[PDB]
Design a protein around this nucleic acid. Structure first.
Lengths: 93, 110, 36, 214, 105, 55, 87
RNA sequence: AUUAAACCUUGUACCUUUUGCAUAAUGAACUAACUAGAAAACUUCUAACUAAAAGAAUUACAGCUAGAAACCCCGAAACCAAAC
């Protein structure tokens, strides 16, 4: 193979930006907040995996239940076929 | 809107007459006149400790670390704590002022 | 990302070889080991 | 007049109290104004940095979500490529997290990176004053300011800390290991220390819960 | 390898030991970083053993240049013009001392 | 957990006795558990090794 | 395009090595080159030979007529080695 | 090795496969890119707390909680549904 004949421009990154500076803040909400709010409640992301984790089949199955009615017909059929392969692999091999 | 006063060095050297300054400060604290067993006087009293430590720190120039603060139960520890020197000179700084030989070159680019 | 330099390691020992051996890594590597 | 503080909870007889210099931010030279006592079970715990290391990993990783996805050979109109959104969330026991917080507090105090203060109130709201004061007291380049509650934190301190990237202002409930490690020195108000001690000392007789404490 | 590599005959620089032995090594250059784990061993070497070597061998010019550096490095120059470069990255004081002695010999 | 109540006569009928007062001045101090019990636990590991642990 | 700056930096060194081999640089005196101290070298030179030299006399011996002309030309914009040479 | 490129001396291409053997047998014009190991039921190890442990649903006469620790790729003849 062949390699670049030009050097990329230098880049400078600020490690004390608010996001990096305040990363992890309020992670002790439960212990310092009387456990009224569990840290799992602070998770933002796909609905079916907020505060929950599982294997690929479990994640796919949970995804289908959460948004199955709101998913596209084509996507739902594809998800059903994909689930079949995942189920057989984990539960028979 | 407040102007910060100049920073001071953290290097403290024990006074040659350390005992004289310490006893004078102890007399200064409250009329003690250095009663016998002075080294064993307990510092548990908050008011007595604050005046004694604060007065000693200003004159002597050494301050009790927060880590070592609770250890300062008795005057003897305070006397021992003050007698140990503290130097701010870096290893390179000491090397520079060490009669560098002609064949040895040091350049600090930092 | 150092695969080129790995080939150079074989090539530098194979620079003095003759024929396609000196320019083919498949053959150059074999020749280098045989020489050693 | 020295400000004298004693631990509200019963300190063990066999354990001597931990002590540190009480400070105030009102003036540049107000480095020491009082002497305070700190619970040995909180401020004299063993320095178990693996727990701190585990907590830091947990902090970085429980929020970790990867959204990478690729089409495999069957989905082509990659044999082992990223497959949709993936999360790494996991939970440490509250006992361990509280212990990790306890361990972190001791390290900062022993390393002279923790500064106990009566209050955060500042004479001026200028961010310059806070930076200069940190230099005046030889604080680290990064200083963390903690107050008892977010709602009551003084306005003057907010302006100074808000404009400073390396000086971050957090409430008592917002304390976390990552911020303490990232910040060279820690500044804690006296009420916050009691607030932290109460929750940390609550771990005593940790009834295994069959339902939320509330 | 012998066919593909150069060779020489036994020889002396200028019959160095006939009248009096002269050390070939003439100059040493050291680069250090104030804040670098790699150069810590070299930094410790400077505190303790560099002076002893300098006193033992004052006929070698030693240059110590602490500077922002990714990897500490030592350069040895000889009278005949030979120059040898050795990286000091993450090496202990004991290892450094042994290497320098070999360079001098 | 409630603290143990002061008893007129020790040992308690079950046999519990609070730590002796004054405490020993040895360099090492062994504190009681949160349950005011001696921190000694019998343990067996690997199915064949009996153990006892002081914490 | 392959990503990464180390690979780009590595190739730049690779190009430099090829260029140096093709076109070796012209020789230059060690005095112009870095890490040269005339006073230190002379002291080391005398010690290296295990012989005693008068620093002033040795420098004059090193001093040459051609060197003075260059310095004089710069000066326009000192003892030669002839006396020592004869002895 | 050598003063010397060739001469003198030594030496039955490589992978896979047969068996720990090929003068068997497969596969390779060469260059660049692309091209195949994935799961925690139990155990050991690493720690927290302990007759209790887990932030509800779990186990216990030293247990309990947490972490780490695992098992590929390509390739048929076929078979069926719905269009054309």
């Amino acid at each position: 193979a062949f390699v670049r004949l030009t050097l990329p421009p230098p880049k400078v990154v600020d490690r004390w930006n608010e996001k990096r500076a305040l990363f992890g803040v309020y992670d002790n909400i439960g212990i310092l907040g009387n456990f009224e709010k569990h840290p799992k409640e602070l998770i933002k992301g796909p609905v079916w995996l907020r505060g929950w984790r599982g294997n690929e089949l479990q994640r796919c199955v949970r995804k289908k239940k959460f948004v199955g009615n709101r998913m596209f017909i084509e996507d739902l059929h594809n998800l059903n076929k994909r689930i079949s392969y995942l189920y057989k692999h984990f539960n028979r091999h | 809107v407040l102007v910060c006063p100049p920073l001071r060095s953290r290097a403290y050297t024990p006074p040659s007459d350390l005992q004289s300054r310490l006893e004078s400060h102890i007399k200064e604290v409250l009329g003690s006149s250095l009663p016998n067993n002075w080294q064993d006087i307990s510092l548990d009293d908050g008011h007595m400790k604050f005046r004694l430590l604060a007065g000693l720190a200003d004159g002597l120039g050494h301050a009790v670390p927060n880590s070592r603060l609770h250890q300062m139960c008795r005057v003897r520890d305070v006397l021992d704590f003050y007698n140990v020197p503290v130097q701010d000179k870096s290893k390179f700084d000491e090397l520079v002022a060490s009669n560098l030989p002609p064949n040895l070159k040091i350049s600090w680019s930092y | 990302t150092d695969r080129y330099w790995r080939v150079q390691e074989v090539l530098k020992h194979a620079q003095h070889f003759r024929g396609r051996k000196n320019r083919c890594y498949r053959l150059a590597v074999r020749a280098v080991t045989r020489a050693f | 007049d020295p400000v004298l503080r004693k631990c509200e909870l019963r300190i063990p007889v066999h354990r001597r109290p931990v002590q540190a210099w009480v400070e105030s931010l009102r003036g540049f030279e107000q480095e020491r104004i009082g002497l305070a006592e700190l619970h040995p079970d909180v401020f004299a715990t063993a320095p178990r940095l693996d727990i701190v290391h585990q907590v830091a990993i947990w902090q970085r990783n429980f929020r970790r979500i990867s959204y990478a996805n690729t089409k495999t050979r069957a989905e082509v109109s990659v044999a082992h490529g990223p497959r949709g959104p993936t999360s790494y969330y996991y939970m440490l026991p509250m006992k361990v997290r509280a212990l990790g917080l306890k361990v972190a507090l001791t390290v900062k105090l022993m390393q002279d990176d923790l500064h106990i203060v009566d209050s955060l109130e500042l004479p001026t709201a200028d961010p310059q004053y806070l930076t200069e004061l940190a230099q005046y007291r030889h604080w680290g380049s990064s200083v963390l300011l903690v107050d008892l509650t977010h709602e009551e934190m003084p306005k003057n301190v907010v302006a100074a800390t808000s404009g400073l990237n390396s000086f971050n202002l957090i409430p008592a409930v917002g304390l976390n290991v990552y911020s303490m490690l990232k910040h060279q020195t820690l500044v804690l108000t006296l009420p916050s220390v009691a607030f932290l001690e109460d929750k940390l000392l609550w771990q005593d007789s940790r009834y295994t819960p069959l339902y939320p404490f509330r | 390898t012998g066919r593909g590599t150069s060779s020489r005959f036994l020889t002396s620089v200028l019959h160095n030991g006939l009248g009096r032995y002269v050390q070939q090594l003439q100059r040493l250059s050291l680069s250090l970083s104030r804040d670098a784990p790699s150069s810590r061993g070299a930094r410790e070497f400077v505190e303790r053993e560099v002076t002893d070597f300098a006193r033992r061998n004052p006929g070698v010019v030693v240059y110590v240049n602490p500077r922002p550096c990714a990897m500490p490095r030592i350069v040895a120059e000889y009278l005949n013009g030979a120059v040898r470069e050795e990286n000091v990255n993450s090496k202990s004081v004991e290892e450094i001392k042994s290497l320098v002695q070999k360079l001098a010999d | 957990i409630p603290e143990p109540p002061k008893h007129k006569h020790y040992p308690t009928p079950s046999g519990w006795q609070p730590p002796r007062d004054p405490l020993p001045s040895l360099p090492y101090f062994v504190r009681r558990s949160r349950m005011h019990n001696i921190p000694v636990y019998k343990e067996i590991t690997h199915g064949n090794r009996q153990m006892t642990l002081i914490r | 395009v392959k990503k990464g700056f180390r690979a780009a930096f590595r190739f730049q060194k690779e190009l430099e090595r090829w260029r140096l081999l093709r076109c070796p640089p012209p020789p230059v005196r060690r005095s112009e080159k870095p890490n040269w101290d005339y006073h230190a070298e002379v002291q080391a030179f005398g010690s290296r030979l295990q012989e005693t030299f008068s620093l002033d006399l040795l420098k004059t011996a090193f001093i040459n007529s051609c060197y003075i002309k260059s310095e004089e030309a710069k000066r326009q914009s000192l003892k030669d080695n002839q006396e020592l040479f004869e002895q």
